[PDB]
């Protein structure tokens, strides 16, 4: 018999990357997964490729057809799989295709927000078959043709980066030699955030406030200088709420958060300077 | 040789627009019709096969092709579904659906923005040499009063039948890479009544009252009142943000707030350009 590993060729079509959850470090991906290999040759109606869809896929598996389960390593819960098809060629070839929508996790550093860059990854690995049984021969990635990115939250930078590696599991080495390694596809999409709504509605008005905060010293009396500094303090607190109400939830501080602390610092410094003149 | 499929789409509701995700919810019915292989039906009359009974007919050899909503976000919630099988081979598939659909949505002109709500239907596995759409008919909701509605539907539904040529699977087989696509479009205008009376009008009365600071006698009065108006524009900006949809760009309302900040910062530069 042929005891060599089955070479599986994969294509991933990325329709959309959206719904980033900063605190959960997740993002939603909509697309298509295409998996291809060569099985045992067969007789198909009229010796033409045979289309097997959705629930019929199961009837073929029950009847002995080998359709391995490929897992999205970084998926958060079961992905919403839409339509699925199989194409059974008489020469032995098998082409599996399915629509998917899933929440994917990855290390996301938002410390440079709104000027942060992200790498959206998809990790694919056979759930049960090691690389002695099933190995990935290649990976092709196709992404959406965009007209205007001005209207989009994220700006995709460059082509998709791909890898084919082997994962060695130590919890598996307790059975048979060279059976603990798994083939893994890694897909990476690099994107830069759109800083439009953040330059004009957060850095610019905050800049105009921090700039106007130093114009309290040009007031005539000490009574005027002080009462205006408390008004600016109230404005920085009111602006700190405005940001909190819109900006994403994070366990650290962003560029905007640092600017707010700078705004608090600038007023507290100005207040210490006003007192260091009167008494 | 390709199977002619005739489609009818009924749009009951378009709602739940998500500005940031560029999605909208659509409730309706899909009707697909084709002539297949002749059959024997009980009493030689048309046969209604509902919901779970269809799965039994498919396992037994009945051809029911999978038609995919190209711009659907996740699997649509399919309600009741049925077949009507004729002895002459005619097949009528009808189903109720509710799905989240995506499309390019430009909200830069908000609240005066116009949207095109589309639905794209295409066979999931069968190319146009096997399955082609012969026609599309769209039926939309009869509205009594749009005053009470968020969106205002403009005109009849626009429909298209196109062929999608894929460059991948061009090598899979020659002249087998084209797919039949139906495109249905609903044009709508946003109802700006809430944003006119509650956002543009009060902001106007504030930007108008912001110039009334010059009528003051002393410099101490003119400046302290300008900071109060500054606090009001920030107060109005945080009022706005709490209601306004989440967007990666600025709207007409956002530009009016920046104009409000600009007007005060200009007035402040004017007061300083008199004293020192």
């Amino acid at each position: 018999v042929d005891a060599r590993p089955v070479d599986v060729s994969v294509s991933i079509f990325i329709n959309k990357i959206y719904g980033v959850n900063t605190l959960e470090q997740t993002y939603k991906v909509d697309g298509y997964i295409v998996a291809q290999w060569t099985g045992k040759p067969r007789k198909t109606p009229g010796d033409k490729p045979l289309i097997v869809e959705n629930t019929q896929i199961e009837r073929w598996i029950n009847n002995g057809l080998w359709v391995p389960a490929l897992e999205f390593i970084n998926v958060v819960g079961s992905p919403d799989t839409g339509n699925k098809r199989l194409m059974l060629f008489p020469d032995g070839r098998v082409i599996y295709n399915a629509r998917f929508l899933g929440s994917f996790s990855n290390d996301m550093d938002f410390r440079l927000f709104p000027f942060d860059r992200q790498q959206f990854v998809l990790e694919l690995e056979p759930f049960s078959y090691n690389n002695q049984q099933l190995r990935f021969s290649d990976i092709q990635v196709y992404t959406e043709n965009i007209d205007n990115e001005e209207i989009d939250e994220w700006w995709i930078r460059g082509k998709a980066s791909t890898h084919i590696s082997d994962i060695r599991y130590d919890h598996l080495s307790s059975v048979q030699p060279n059976q603990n390694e798994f083939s893994r596809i890694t897909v990476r999409i690099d994107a830069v955030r759109n800083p439009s709504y953040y330059l004009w509605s957060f850095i610019l008005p905050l800049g105009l406030i921090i700039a106007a905060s130093w114009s309290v010293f040009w007031l005539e009396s000490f009574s005027e200088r002080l009462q205006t500094s408390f008004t600016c303090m109230l404005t920085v607190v009111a602006y700190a709420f405005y940001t909190s109400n819109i900006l994403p939830r994070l366990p650290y501080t962003t560029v905007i958060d640092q600017m707010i602390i700078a705004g608090y610092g600038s007023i507290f410094a100005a207040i210490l300077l006003i007192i260091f003149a009167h008494h | 040789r390709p199977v002619d499929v005739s489609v009818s789409i009924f749009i009951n509701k378009i709602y739940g627009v998500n500005t940031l995700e560029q999605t909208y919810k659509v409730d309706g019915y899909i009707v697909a019709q084709w002539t297949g292989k002749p059959r024997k039906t009980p009493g030689d009359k048309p046969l209604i096969v509902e919901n779970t009974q269809i799965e039994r007919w498919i396992n037994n050899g009945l051809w029911v092709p999978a038609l995919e909503f190209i711009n659907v976000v996740g699997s649509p919630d399919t309600g009741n579904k049925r077949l009507m099988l004729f002895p002459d081979g005619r097949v009528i598939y009808n189903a109720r659906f509710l799905g989240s659909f995506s499309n390019d949505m430009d909200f830069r002109l908000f609240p005066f923005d116009r949207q095109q709500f589309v639905l794209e239907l295409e066979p999931f596995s069968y190319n146009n040499q096997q399955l082609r759409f012969s026609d599309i008919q769209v039926y939309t909701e009869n509205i009594d009063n749009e005053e009470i509605d968020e969106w205002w539907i403009r005109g009849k539904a626009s429909t298209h039948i196109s062929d999608i040529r894929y460059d991948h699977l061009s090598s899979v087989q020659p002249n087998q890479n084209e797919f039949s696509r139906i495109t249905v479009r609903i044009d709508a205008v946003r109802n700006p009544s809430y944003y006119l009376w509650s956002f543009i009008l009060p902001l106007g009365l504030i930007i108008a009252a912001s110039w009334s600071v010059f009528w003051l006698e002393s410099f101490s009065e003119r400046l302290q009142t300008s900071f109060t108006c500054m606090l009001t524009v920030v107060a109005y900006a945080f009022y706005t943000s709490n209601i306004l949809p989440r967007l990666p760009y600025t709207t007409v309302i956002d530009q009016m707030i920046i104009a409000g900040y600009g007007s005060i910062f200009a007035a402040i530069l004017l007061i300083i350009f008199a004293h020192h």
Partner: nanobody
């Protein structure tokens, strides 16, 4: 944003023509470009444009594999290779740029239209 079509002319039925569209101005991609046609006393109908996903192209139902849309992103140009021309294909072929929009096939979503290139298929 100026568009200019060329490559039209008089052809016999079964013949071929290669239409060309030269783009100049505020264009960073040839993707927004689409071909349309308009016969006298008839509406402007969609012919071909780029599909949403990579490798795909949208064609009108009358094309039936005969026409092919190609692009030269260096010269900001799109080409329509028209083969097996029938007299029904006689019209003025227009090249438009998608002024954004959310329906590739609707002429309303296109601006910066060219003068048009006449293709006449005889018998």
């Amino acid at each position: 944003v100026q568009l200019q079509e060329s490559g039209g002319g008089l052809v016999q039925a079964g013949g071929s023509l290669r239409l060309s569209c030269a783009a100049s101005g505020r264009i960073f991609s040839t993707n927004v470009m689409g071909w349309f046609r308009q016969a006298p006393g008839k509406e402007r109908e969609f012919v071909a444009t780029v599909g949403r996903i990579g490798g795909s192209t949208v064609y009108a139902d009358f094309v039936k594999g005969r026409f092919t849309l190609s692009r030269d992103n260096a010269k900001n140009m799109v080409y329509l290779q028209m083969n097996s021309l029938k007299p029904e294909d006689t019209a003025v072929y227009y090249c438009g740029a998608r002024i954004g929009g959310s329906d590739r096939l609707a002429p309303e979503n296109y601006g910066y239209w060219g003068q048009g290139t006449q293709v006449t298929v005889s018998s």
